[PDB]
């Protein structure tokens, strides 16, 4: 079944403040399940042999710290990575304006003009909680100049798999 | 719950006509249920276990294979017992068996432990046997308590830092114990994922390295795969349950991994013997085989 | 062994960091099971990150890095540090999870300038009373580990930001530790805590307090001083009530779950408490009858979980809960649901699972946004007419219910998606199933009273998996029955009279 040998390895950073649900999300993706329980995040590596557009690869997504009080190990993960999933609740008015911030970041470590990462919008399925509208998404995506996802995490699972689906393709295309 | 006198009915049978029913007042095995799964979530997923210790495979629902175990290698607490999962389904008498299971994983929480195995999933036990037991016995909301303890229970255990046991198997996914501790519970086995793969994988010899079960659920591996999983992590021993073999334990891959079914005359069909181990200080193994 | 009866790599990047002078040498997950002793030269090295390689013991050489504040450690295999680790008079910044570790080295407690300390998921099982010399620390965390008490020196760590002790089987907290004032970060969560000190009150600034999965009885009243909490959580804790510390909370409170406790009725105090909740878990303890009106201050609310109880009638002010969108009443003992449910105007998702619900109440055909109506074990007679109206509904299911016909609006559900009908004991069903162009899955299995299925019923193509393995079927041949459910899919296609 999966490839003996000479498998891509894609490091995928997700990256985001404190309840944007990093955690979730990425344990959803992994596990088929939804965890209803907020714990604070340090470094959590995961590991995934997943096919993707008739191409195996593994998906090695490491969840990040998000909160300054653990963000002291934070820098150093976000050196590591290929990709980034700026993830933003569209319920949090606050995570939506540090986008740039995280953006700054990301081209500030990396030392890059453009790297390839993907605004994401998670918690869509709170739609009467729903504070960042798709129109002022797509507006901040294309400012940056990078692809927009409608995603949410809890069960049934909404674009969870579409969302680090998309960015491999992304990354691959440079 | 007197874990003590509920221990005291069921062992009252011992030794009898094969076969005989054991009648708890359900708030037992509820109650036996709502307090083992605190010690199951206490504890960490991945165990870490000292010597001395007896391990075991998988005893279908049958109680006077059960007993048996207990007198060849000795009741607790003179011992150490693990059990590999799957004590459910298949046969007659699960309800028994899995009550005194659980009666001495809350009296010794130290001494006793027990993994998790396929037949633990809500929707496997449907199928083969352990949901119709629940109906005509006790109750169909009894059934719903089980398969939500059920999904509390351990997926691995480190013994001396040396032997790795699990009732499936490996995963493409472990490339470290680190995502095992990572796992989050209470959890229900997926068709796909790191721990389908531990509650439902199988060595298969043919495979140089990866192939399909013949059921379709997860996917085997082959000999290459353990020893490479235990020269990297530093063990030396993975012991194994889930399937059916006919002496009781079997070798897989140089010994490195090695089965152990413990139910002999499986439901009524099988020619099987049933086999236990013991591990001592010195980590040497030995094997207590039941008669066919 | 059991019986039966990198370093290449390493060097090169020391080397590199050595020419460049860099603050920074990464050699974390390139397996070394030795660091090596070269490390000693690179004395001007800021940070240094050896996390998740092979490492069981440091070299000696680490003192000589004088100019270094921050090293990473975790996910190795350590059990030990050395003691010429004390020379470095510059650390703030300790990595240390996921080890051997057996017990605190006695060399961390010979570090001032230490500031954030990452012990966690080792086998330490005591903590030793000289930390004092460790002021400067504001990071501690112990996450799976097997202490038993605490040392009474931990209360003048008044520099300590955050204190994360979980699943460290602790029977007692010291009565001292609220004397820091600078903690908002407490957790102690799946540890064996019988009381709590009544300290922690003095506790000006606190947000998040993790105390689930521990044998408390009781919580302390002055833990109510803390109004910079956010979520409450006592899940698995032996407690049956509550000295009204929710209104004093009542600040910045989110979310309350008082899960699989030994409750009885609800807290004692004013409506009030639940002001500015947004969510519930009851789940798993006996509650017998809630309250009139002790819901009609929560002017938000998304969900409740009512599940393993010992609900017998739901409030006469049940139709009051406009703002609530999801319910949960399964496993419980209802028996008749009353008219004021036409009220939950925005309720999209209810589950009445595991009751004694003989009959639907006509209120249901008001409710327009519902989308789920899980109904299992209920033993329901027939559904009332009122189905017809209501056109939101994407997946509900009838198992294990007494009703032999339908209503004959069934036509007008064209968002329907998951239908469950099987084992009810089923004769006939009407011919609108036809309209419904957009299910994919549906259950008939174990009913002994169908012998036809619909004519209407082959329109519907889209239909993807059938499960009839268990049905009789004496009209219908065998042959195309025991076919498979894709031989009836083309029998439906053509040999039916519909094109
Ligand atoms: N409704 C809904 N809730 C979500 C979703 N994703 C996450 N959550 C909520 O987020 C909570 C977990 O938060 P978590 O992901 O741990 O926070 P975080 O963003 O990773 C940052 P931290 O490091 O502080 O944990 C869960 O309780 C869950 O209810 C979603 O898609 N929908
Ligand atoms: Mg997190
Ligand atoms: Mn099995
Ligand atoms: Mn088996």
Same mark, same amino acid.
């Given at each position: 079944?999966?490839?003996?040998?000479?498998?891509?390895?894609?490091?995928?950073?997700?990256?985001?403040?404190?309840?944007? /649900?990093?955690?979730?999300?990425?344990?959803?993706?992994?596990?088929?399940?939804?965890?209803?329980?907020?714990?604070?995040?340090?470094?959590?590596?995961?590991?995934?042999?997943?096919?993707?557009?008739?191409?195996?690869?593994?998906?090695?997504?490491?969840?990040?710290?998000?909160?300054?009080?653990?963000?002291?190990?934070?820098?150093?993960?976000?050196?590591? /990575?290929?990709?980034?999933?700026?993830?933003?609740?569209?319920?949090?008015?606050?995570?939506?304006?540090?986008?740039?911030?995280?953006?700054?970041?990301?081209?500030?470590?990396?030392?890059?003009?453009?790297?390839?990462?993907?605004?994401?919008?998670?918690?869509?399925? +709170?739609?009467?909680?729903?504070?960042?509208?798709?129109?002022?998404?797509?507006?901040?995506?294309?400012?940056?100049? #990078?692809?927009?996802?409608?995603?949410?995490?809890?069960?049934?699972?909404?674009?969870?798999?579409?969302?680090?689906?998309?960015?491999?393709?992304?990354?691959?295309?440079? | 719950?007197?874990?003590?006198?509920?221990?005291?009915?069921?062992?009252?049978?011992?030794?009898?006509?094969? /076969?005989?029913?054991?009648?708890?007042?359900?708030?037992? #095995?509820?109650?036996?249920?709502?307090?083992?799964?605190?010690?199951?979530?206490?504890?960490?997923?991945?165990?870490?276990?000292?010597?001395?210790?007896?391990?075991?495979?998988?005893?279908?629902?049958?109680?006077?294979?059960?007993?048996?175990?207990?007198?060849?290698?000795?009741?607790?607490?003179?011992?150490?017992?693990?059990?590999?999962?799957?004590?459910?389904?298949?046969?007659?008498?699960?309800?028994?068996?899995?009550?005194?299971?659980?009666?001495?994983? !809350?009296?010794?929480?130290?001494?006793?432990?027990?993994?998790?195995?396929?037949?633990?999933?809500?929707?496997?036990?449907?199928?083969?046997?352990?949901?119709?037991?629940?109906?005509?016995?006790?109750? !169909?909301?009894?059934?719903?308590?089980?398969?939500?303890?059920?999904?509390?229970?351990?997926?691995?255990?480190?013994?001396?830092?040396?032997?790795?046991?699990?009732?499936?198997?490996?995963?493409?996914?472990?490339?470290?114990?680190?995502? #095992?501790?990572?796992?989050?519970?209470?959890?229900?086995?997926?068709?796909?994922?790191?721990?389908?793969?531990?509650?439902?994988?199988?060595?298969?010899?043919?495979?140089?390295?990866?192939?399909?079960?013949?059921?379709?659920?997860?996917?085997?591996?082959?000999?290459?795969?353990?020893?490479?999983?235990?020269?990297?992590?530093?063990?030396?021993?993975?012991?194994?349950?889930?399937?059916?073999?006919?002496?009781?334990?079997?070798?897989?891959?140089?010994?490195?991994?090695?089965?152990?079914?413990?139910?002999?005359?499986?439901?009524?069909?099988?020619?099987?013997?049933?086999?236990?181990? $013991?591990?001592?200080?010195?980590?040497?193994?030995?094997?207590? #085989?039941?008669?066919? | 062994?059991?019986?039966?009866?990198?370093?290449?790599?390493?060097?090169?990047?020391?080397?590199?960091?050595?020419?460049?002078?860099?603050?920074?040498?990464?050699?974390?997950?390139?397996?070394?099971?030795?660091?090596?002793?070269?490390?000693?030269?690179?004395?001007?090295?800021?940070?240094?990150?050896?996390?998740?390689?092979?490492?069981?013991?440091?070299?000696?050489?680490?003192?000589?890095?004088?100019?270094?504040?921050?090293?990473?450690?975790?996910?190795?295999?350590?059990?030990?540090?050395?003691?010429?680790?004390?020379?470095?008079?510059?650390?703030?910044?300790?990595?240390?999870?996921?080890?051997?570790?057996?017990?605190?080295?006695?060399?961390?407690?010979?570090?001032?300038?230490?500031?954030?300390?990452?012990?966690?998921?080792?086998?330490?099982?005591?903590?030793?009373?000289?930390?004092?010399?460790?002021?400067?620390?504001?990071?501690?965390?112990?996450?799976?580990?097997?202490?038993?008490?605490?040392?009474?020196?931990?209360?003048?760590?008044?520099?300590? !930001?955050? +204190?994360?002790?979980?699943?460290?089987?602790?029977?007692?907290?010291?009565?001292?530790?609220?004397?820091?004032?600078?903690?908002?970060?407490?957790?102690?969560?799946?540890?064996?805590?019988?009381?709590?000190?009544?300290?922690?009150?003095?506790?000006?600034?606190?947000?998040?307090?993790?105390?689930?999965?521990?044998?408390?009885?009781?919580?302390?009243?002055?833990?109510?001083?803390?109004?910079?909490?956010?979520?409450?959580?006592?899940?698995?804790?032996?407690?049956?009530?509550?000295?009204?510390?929710?209104?004093? $909370?009542?600040?910045?409170?989110?979310?309350?779950?008082?899960?699989?406790?030994?409750?009885?009725?609800?807290?004692?105090?004013?409506?009030?408490?639940?002001?500015?909740?947004?969510?519930?878990?009851?789940?798993?303890?006996?509650?017998?009858?809630?309250?009139?009106?002790?819901?009609?201050?929560?002017?938000?609310?998304?969900?409740?979980?009512?599940?393993?109880?010992?609900?017998?009638?739901?409030?006469?002010?049940?139709?009051?809960?406009?703002?609530?969108?999801?319910?949960?009443?399964?496993?419980?003992?209802?028996?008749?649901?009353?008219?004021?449910?036409?009220?939950?105007?925005?309720?999209?998702?209810?589950?009445?699972?595991?009751?004694?619900?003989?009959?639907?109440?006509?209120?249901? /055909?008001?409710?327009?946004?519902?989308?789920?109506?899980?109904?299992?074990?209920?033993?329901?007679?027939?559904?009332?007419?009122?189905?017809?109206?209501?056109?939101?509904?994407?997946?509900?299911?009838?198992?294990?219910?007494?009703?032999?016909?339908?209503?004959?609006?069934?036509?007008?559900?064209?968002?329907?998606?998951?239908?469950?009908?099987?084992?009810?004991?089923?004769?006939?069903?009407?011919?609108?199933?036809?309209?419904?162009?957009?299910?994919?899955?549906?259950?008939?299995?174990?009913?002994?009273?169908?012998?036809?299925?619909?004519?209407?019923?082959?329109?519907?193509?889209?239909? $993807?998996?059938?499960?009839?393995?268990?049905?009789?079927?004496?009209?219908?041949?065998?042959?195309?029955?025991?076919?498979?459910?894709?031989?009836?899919?083309?029998?439906?296609?053509?040999?039916?009279?519909?094109?």
């Amino acid at each position: 079944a999966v490839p003996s040998d000479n498998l891509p390895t894609y490091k995928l950073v997700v990256v985001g403040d404190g309840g944007v /649900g990093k955690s979730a999300l990425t344990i959803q993706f992994f596990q088929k399940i939804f965890v209803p329980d907020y714990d604070p995040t340090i470094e959590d590596s995961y590991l995934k042999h997943t096919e993707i557009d008739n191409q195996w690869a593994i998906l090695d997504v490491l969840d990040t710290a998000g909160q300054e009080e653990f963000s002291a190990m934070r820098e150093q993960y976000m050196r590591t /990575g290929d990709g980034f999933l700026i993830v933003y609740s569209v319920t949090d008015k606050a995570s939506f304006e540090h986008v740039d911030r995280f953006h700054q970041l990301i081209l500030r470590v990396k030392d890059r003009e453009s790297f390839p990462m993907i605004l994401v919008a998670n918690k869509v399925d +709170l739609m009467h909680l729903r504070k960042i509208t798709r129109e002022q998404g797509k507006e901040m995506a294309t400012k940056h100049n #990078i692809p927009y996802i409608e995603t949410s995490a809890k069960d049934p699972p909404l674009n969870v798999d579409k969302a680090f689906h998309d960015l491999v393709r992304v990354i691959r295309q440079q | 719950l007197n874990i003590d006198s509920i221990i005291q009915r069921l062992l009252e049978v011992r030794g009898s006509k094969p /076969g005989k029913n054991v009648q708890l007042q359900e708030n037992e #095995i509820r109650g036996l249920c709502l307090k083992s799964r605190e010690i199951f979530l206490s504890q960490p997923i991945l165990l870490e276990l000292e010597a001395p210790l007896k391990i075991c495979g998988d005893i279908h629902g049958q109680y006077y294979d059960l007993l048996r175990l207990f007198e060849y290698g000795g009741f607790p607490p003179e011992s150490n017992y693990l059990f590999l999962g799957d004590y459910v389904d298949r046969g007659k008498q699960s309800l028994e068996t899995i009550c005194l299971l659980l009666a001495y994983k !809350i009296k010794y929480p130290e001494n006793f432990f027990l993994l998790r195995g396929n037949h633990e999933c809500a929707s496997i036990n449907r199928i083969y046997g352990f949901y119709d037991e629940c109906k005509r016995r006790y109750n !169909i909301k009894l059934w719903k308590t089980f398969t939500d303890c059920f999904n509390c229970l351990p997926i691995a255990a480190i013994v001396d830092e040396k032997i790795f046991c699990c009732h499936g198997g490996l995963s493409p996914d472990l490339q470290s114990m680190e995502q #095992i501790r990572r796992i989050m519970r209470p959890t229900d086995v997926p068709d796909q994922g790191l721990l389908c793969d531990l509650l439902w994988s199988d060595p298969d010899k043919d495979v140089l390295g990866w192939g399909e079960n013949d059921r379709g659920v997860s996917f085997t591996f082959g000999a290459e795969v353990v020893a490479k999983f235990l020269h990297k992590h530093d063990l030396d021993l993975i012991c194994r349950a889930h399937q059916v073999v006919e002496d009781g334990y079997e070798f897989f891959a140089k010994r490195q991994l090695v089965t152990l079914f413990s139910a002999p005359n499986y439901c009524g069909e099988f020619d099987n013997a049933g086999a236990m181990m $013991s591990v001592d200080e010195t980590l040497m193994c030995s094997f207590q #085989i039941l008669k066919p | 062994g059991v019986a039966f009866s990198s370093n290449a790599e390493v060097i090169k990047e020391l080397n590199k960091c050595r020419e460049e002078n860099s603050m920074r040498l990464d050699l974390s997950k390139r397996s070394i099971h030795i660091l090596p002793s070269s490390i000693k030269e690179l004395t001007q090295l800021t940070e240094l990150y050896l996390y998740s390689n092979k490492l069981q013991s440091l070299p000696a050489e680490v003192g000589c890095l004088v100019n270094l504040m921050t090293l990473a450690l975790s996910e190795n295999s350590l059990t030990s540090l050395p003691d010429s680790l004390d020379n470095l008079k510059k650390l703030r910044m300790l990595d240390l999870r996921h080890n051997k570790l057996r017990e605190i080295p006695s060399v961390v407690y010979r570090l001032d300038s230490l500031t954030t300390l990452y012990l966690r998921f080792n086998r330490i099982t005591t903590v030793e009373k000289d930390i004092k010399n460790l002021s400067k620390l504001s990071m501690l965390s112990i996450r799976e580990n097997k202490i038993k008490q605490l040392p009474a020196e931990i209360g003048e760590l008044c520099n300590l !930001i955050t +204190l994360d002790v979980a699943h460290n089987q602790l029977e007692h907290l010291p009565k001292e530790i609220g004397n820091c004032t600078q903690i908002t970060n407490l957790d102690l969560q799946h540890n064996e805590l019988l009381d709590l000190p009544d300290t922690i009150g003095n506790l000006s600034s606190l947000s998040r307090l993790g105390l689930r999965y521990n044998r408390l009885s009781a919580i302390p009243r002055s833990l109510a001083k803390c109004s910079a909490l956010e979520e409450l959580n006592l899940e698995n804790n032996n407690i049956s009530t509550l000295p009204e510390s929710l209104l004093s $909370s009542l600040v910045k409170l989110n979310s309350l779950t008082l899960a699989r406790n030994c409750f009885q009725l609800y807290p004692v105090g004013g409506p009030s408490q639940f002001s500015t909740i947004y969510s519930l878990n009851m789940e798993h303890n006996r509650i017998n009858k809630i309250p009139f009106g002790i819901f009609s201050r929560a002017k938000v609310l998304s969900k409740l979980n009512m599940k393993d109880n010992q609900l017998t009638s739901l409030p006469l002010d049940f139709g009051t809960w406009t703002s609530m969108v999801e319910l949960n009443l399964a496993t419980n003992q209802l028996t008749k649901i009353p008219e004021d449910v036409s009220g939950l105007v925005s309720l999209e998702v209810l589950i009445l699972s595991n009751n004694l619900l003989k009959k639907l109440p006509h209120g249901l /055909g008001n409710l327009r946004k519902l989308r789920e109506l899980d109904l299992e074990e209920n033993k329901l007679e027939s559904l009332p007419n009122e189905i017809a109206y209501l056109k939101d509904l994407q997946k509900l299911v009838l198992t294990n219910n007494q009703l032999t016909t339908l209503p004959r609006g069934i036509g007008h559900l064209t968002n329907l998606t998951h239908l469950g009908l099987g084992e009810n004991l089923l004769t006939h069903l009407p011919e609108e199933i036809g309209t419904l162009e957009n299910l994919e899955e549906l259950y008939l299995n174990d009913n002994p009273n169908l012998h036809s299925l619909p004519f209407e019923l082959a329109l519907c193509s889209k239909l $993807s998996i059938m499960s009839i393995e268990n049905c009789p079927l004496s009209h219908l041949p065998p042959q195309i029955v025991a076919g498979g459910p894709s031989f009836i899919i083309q029998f439906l296609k053509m040999q039916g009279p519909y094109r």
